[model samples]
Target: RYRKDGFDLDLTYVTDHVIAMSFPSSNPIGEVSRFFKTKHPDKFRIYNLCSERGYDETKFDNHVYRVMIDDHNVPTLVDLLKFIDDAKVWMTSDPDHVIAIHCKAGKGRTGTLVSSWLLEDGKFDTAKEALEYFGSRRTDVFQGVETASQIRYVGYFEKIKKNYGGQLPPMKKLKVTGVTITAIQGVGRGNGSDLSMQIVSERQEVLLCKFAEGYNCALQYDATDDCVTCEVKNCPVLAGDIKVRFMSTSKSLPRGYDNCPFYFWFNTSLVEGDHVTLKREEIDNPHKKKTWKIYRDNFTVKLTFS
Candidate 1:
């Protein structure tokens, strides 16, 4: 059984020769160790799988084991495999032991580790089945469904095909159908192309892209006309809303040129097959416009599809 604040405590259905693993996230090492020592002292062994250092072995009297794994934000399949091997070796040596694995938050890293274990030990045939099994037990876990979907069937089939040298079961097919783009406001000059966008898909593959460049929004008094623009060409957004936004920045004026704030002044409508184009139009200024002619063309574009 696993318990945490703000989430329900789940009791595992016990069976002979079957050990239940409780993986929690972000609980203090001392607290978790103490809990395991008191509640599951005989049946379970707690292992702290964390990236943080500072776990006091002396305080726990070496009763709790700490496995140091670098938390690189995202754990790759390689990391998961390594954890499984390590955990398996450890569990095999310990008689009558169930392993309780946890990291901070018990979601990403913890889920990855536990799910991988289920895949290897349970012969789950896919990461999806492993995840479903894990999630059924702990609802708070969040492995991108797409990742689970890809891992489950393809990964399992590949393993089977390699060993048996025969055809494996077909994988579940996932398709991305549509996308949505939202426009941001107050884009500063030179950074106008920097737009925050999110990609929504049918297969739950939601990706977000933030523009790296900034924009300028000067609709007021200035001599030279300078603007920024962007075009999302060939984007796979077939039939969804396309939003555009503009914002201002605190850029100093160039020598002999008073900076005029700019804003988005074009159509923001888009269709499924439409080549989305964004532009920043330059307006004329009278005060400092008595000298050289400033060029008025500037823009950026992006293309996406499934």
Candidate 2:
């Protein structure tokens, strides 16, 4: 429906400098070189969306820039934005720059990315316009977007821009399974005597510690998410309230950043089910902010730690 150079090469133009195509499996490696040299010798860049097995990057020279987005899938908003920025940097460096994009069949996955780019680059008024633009250029016998998920993914651009402030947030869940607090044993104040600690999370053997009494890994972000089996009759998991500090106690570093007070206070990285707590005086200060505690339970962390 659209256009093809030879075979089912599904080649179509999207923008002045951007072209979309299907994998050149039908032709020889020699034609690959000839295609670029003849059509877009001007600082040409390749954005490959085919699955890993479809093509090899080594065939092309240094100017070839390829991104593998699996067939039938769309890249995340954050990653797609990165590609737009990368394409701009590569394309703008030379006036004669042009970019080629492709997947296995090339229309569906390639259309998703190109449409998403149109939205992010302010090229089109809406995701629909972006998709329709590609559909017009690429298909008449068929629709450019093949799947419902593909359409939803293109639409997700608006939701992501509005909610995440045009950038994705850190891991959505603070889902903390376990933390390691290894210290140079037989030295410092950690003369291990039934050590106290905080909440926990999942599998593998490491420095395991109890999040709190009853309350662990907050209420939702705890080991329970991954606690499949109980290893012992009484759970090996230990819980105690401990103050949170980030000072390294290694010999190489002397008089570390946080020289604690003689009677250093202890704080829990927990909200409920504890009484004695050590909270920092710094509220406005971002770096020296307080940790999890009972009174400051109302004070919230907008981001969930990964």
Candidate 3:
């Protein structure tokens, strides 16, 4: 049973025997039970498997049967095992039952648990396969970084297998290279939006540049908060000497909202003498009910990399 806007459309193909886990935000347990009783009273049962008392009034009203687990933030291995056991019980008892498992966005917490099930069911050789499969089924799945970490834990399967007289699989080797960065030009309407660069990697290929896009003193604006903003626009050079200078419309006048700050970021790997240019666009702020304009031609910067 589905009552949410995205649920029925997304899971239309799921059969009545298969339970549809509610997307956490939808909180549709009551509707789920009612649909099962009315549509497939002879053959289907409704179940809710979640890590918390999700927002569902029917669950309390009807005393619905549910298997509760902890939120995904819990890092303990024991807790994860307990969740796996609960899921296993439901899966085994209703072999013909299609269990819909979901968490927020059906990505992180849901992916972690579902991938484990796939591993246990022998449908996937490793958690990596399970994760990939989930992503394939739902391109937007596994939005959390923790899901990736959990999938990495699939390597533990190898150790466990070896402990039980199974041979370990060969591991693959990967190569990685560092990147270099540099900056070429800085542009802004006022001084507050100044962009500055910093080296972020030892290889000289990566650069960490800061871009402030709101009225601030760093851009050298004389006006109050209403006057300025900053942003890092582009980079000119990859390696070598870089010279930075500021250009303004009226050097004698104090900086104000009429001008914006613009900056550049680049990698040292860029070849020397390469020409780079930066541009800015104007936009209207719906909340502020005013136009935020940027003057790019008034500001420019040139840097060379060795």
Candidate 4:
């Protein structure tokens, strides 16, 4: 005979150290946090699979471990392998902890990653079984995991076996989604900026364009093979008493552009991710020019050093 059973986790679940949740947009982050707030209280780790940042992480200060994978779509074999390795390391440190796997809607991506874990752990021999098991346990709210590409999700390990013979890579990425340069105002609740901005990437020198519109020009955001994504919609801004001495005091310049500012901050396309801080200062150009460096106030995404 057989046995019919109940569920394991809810929209967010925890059993055998596996916590499942939906890192979606429509859902209020506060609501999600409230539901998941006390799940571990410093005894949990998070695997964020969302494409963009929607919630504040400080809310999860309770979690002892956290990692984000900006794979707006299904993950690669490399992602699963590295995640297993990470979880293994984490478990070694604490032994009794929960590992959360989440993504927008929390279905297809979650199933894909979980299936890989199941295969690697020898729980199942194929992707289908792992996915079916997940669906069976989480039948009520498996909208995101049971995606259209469920069939395509299974081949992740085969691809890995074909490529790495079994080794996995890191979960962090260098290229992230482009975040628009938002405007700062004394007023509260701003819609956005007068100049819509969206620059997403990793680390490197901002190849600043020396000419007007040079910010966008200097940054190598294009259809070509590069790191960060660039678009004209990104309005860096040209506010304040800009348009100062371009060459020197005797040879100053003017400002006549809305989106074009004297110095627009650029971002590093961390297809992976990195720790970042804003740095701004003055530097003398060897070409006999006066120049204050950058206002690198913008922060980069978290990095995975290990």
Candidate 5:
């Protein structure tokens, strides 16, 4: 813990040049200036990874950078690799240059970036080694990365470093054959909900498939799995980040102001296998303020690519 005046920074040096910490509460920007003077003599930069929040701007001008990532989730391959490139250029330019990264709690999102940096720097041969090292360095009470998809993203970084020479793989045409959703209680209509999905690639809407009676796709309900499967045949040329949004098609269920109930985003180039599964933590619900509640910590959605 680093404290100066009224500001407290939960700082840990994961490497000689890499520092991880929770979001520091800066009072009156001068506190930050004093902390910077007292903390270390080396020149450093800060990378902030919170999407819905930000720090005081006066203290962070030009010296700090922001990457808006959802809490407990991974970044797009394009954004992550670009960040690595920028960080490497700055750090390798001088021996005294250091990089400090932070999120809300400084565990999941911070660890993901730090571990990815370790892999790209050849500090660890495997993603597991880098992840464990960051966890041990940051704190023993909690693992560095908390969510499964966040962990998978670090592994994805390792794969790219090994096979793709520290770059994203070539983009491929993605054919989403099916989407399976399980443990969807209290959403829409319990186990018999009508749902629609929209696929957006590179910020363009590509597919609109619905499972209602008058709409496009077919829905299959399995009693054994207690899951709902939707068949989608839309093929989109995948490149950077792809967004998959699911919404209630039932007229009985009230919709959010944005009309989207839940959605998840992923990088098309990061699909290592033919399929990817997203659990509760990776999924997002836009309307948390409403009286109606949906799945939380109890759903698994899988997308199968053909």
Candidate 6:
């Protein structure tokens, strides 16, 4: 259920002392303050999961912890594990204390992390169960953890816990061979060459960047595959989280405030085999396709590594 204050404490875990809610505005935050004073009068923590925007966390004093997860994308394995462990420690320390977790709409990003917590704490035996439970708890308008990639990431966490002994496997150093995006209907010129790419590593270093057409270099359009491939040459060694940003090369094409038409983030530690294929549901800001003039539902982005 929800309160007029705009929060939903998973009453199933009322004794476990955890609540999931929407990003609290100033007024709702005040309601939270008073609510906490009556329910959990001891120590509490806020796990802010929004990467795009932030709020005045000082109102909660030093109790606010943040792990920046971009909307519709998963967190790096390292960050995900650290956040779970930190929140676990606090929850176990005092039964009276609660940890409030929220993202923008409190659906995808929020459920991903909270479901991971459920798995780690052994509240649910498997990632699927945890996700189902979280979704049941946070079914406001949208179901919780609603994306394929986000669900995959929770399963990723379950894999690490069950197989790798609750630790990330050894990081793999890889090189980007190329990137391909298909289904460009309604996009600029209705072709992949109209898109540009910027490959960035966890440390925020630009490994490779390719524009639509360059001096003696350009993205290859495969008519047979019905896709455009950006061949990456001289790629530096890559490890840790990698961000792939796709931008519209045409100035007339609409873009996000960050100038990206589409983007996705993935960790090298989780890359299986030689490549990862991202469907429309996996990409961040898929809804932006309407404004950006891309048919996101039919689009697919693939990154090949070596």
Task: State each model's CA lDDT, in order.
Answer: 0.38, 0.47, 0.37, 0.40, 0.72, 0.72
Return the lDDT, model 4, position 59: 65
**How well does model 6 score by local distance difference test?**
0.72
Distance from true location, Cα of 49 in model 2, Å? 1.1
Candidate 6, residues 1-306, lDDT tens digits: the string is: 444454544223412577777776743666656566656665788888988777877667657899988776778778899998899899888867688788776778888888888888888888888888887776621255755557778888999998889888877888887777787656666666566677777647565464465522357777676677777777778888777777766765565434466666777887899999988766755644344345556688888889
Quote model 1's TM-score: 0.41
Model 6 RMSD vs true structure: 4.1
After superposition, the stretches of candidate 2 with alpha carbons farther than 4 Å from their true spots are 1-9, 26-28, 54-59, 140-142, 162-165, 174-306
What CA root-mean-square deviation does each model show from the true structure? 16.4, 18.0, 15.4, 17.1, 5.3, 4.1
TM-score each candidate.
Answer: 0.41, 0.50, 0.39, 0.43, 0.73, 0.79
**Model 4, position 278: C-alpha lDDT score:** 19
Scored against the true structure, residue 39 in model 3 reaches a CA lDDT of: 49
Considering only N, C-alpha and C atoms within 3 Å, which residue pairs clash in candidate 6?
none
How does model 4 score by TM-score? 0.43
Give the count of colliding residue pairs in each prediction: 49, 6, 45, 29, 0, 0
Instruction: Point out the higher-scoring one by lDDT: 4 or 5.
Output: 5
Which candidate would rank higher by lDDT, 1 or 2? 2
Ranking of all candidate structures by their TM-score, best first: 6, 5, 2, 4, 1, 3
Q: Against the true structure, candidate 4 has what lDDT?
A: 0.40
TM-score result, candidate 2: 0.50
Q: Write the per-residue lDDT of candidate 3 for residues 1-306, one digit (tens) a residue.
A: 344533342332122333324453444545554544454443433333455655663433443444443343222333345555655676578655445555444544455556655666667776566667655544422332132223333334323333532322332221111111112222233343334434322224243434343221123233432333233333322332221223334333223221322222222222224333332211101011121233322222323222
Expressed as tens digits, the lDDT of each residue in 1-306 for candidate 1 is 445543333334222322234333334445655655665566564556676744565434564555554342223333444555666776677676566665554543455556666655665766556666666654422231122222332343335335534232232222122222222222233333433333333223244433444111111212232332233322343232122222223443222211232211111121124333322221112112331132223322223233
Error of 3 at 235 (Å): 43
- What is the Cα-based lDDT of residue 160 in candidate 1? 38
lDDT of 2: 0.47
lDDT of 2 at 126: 74
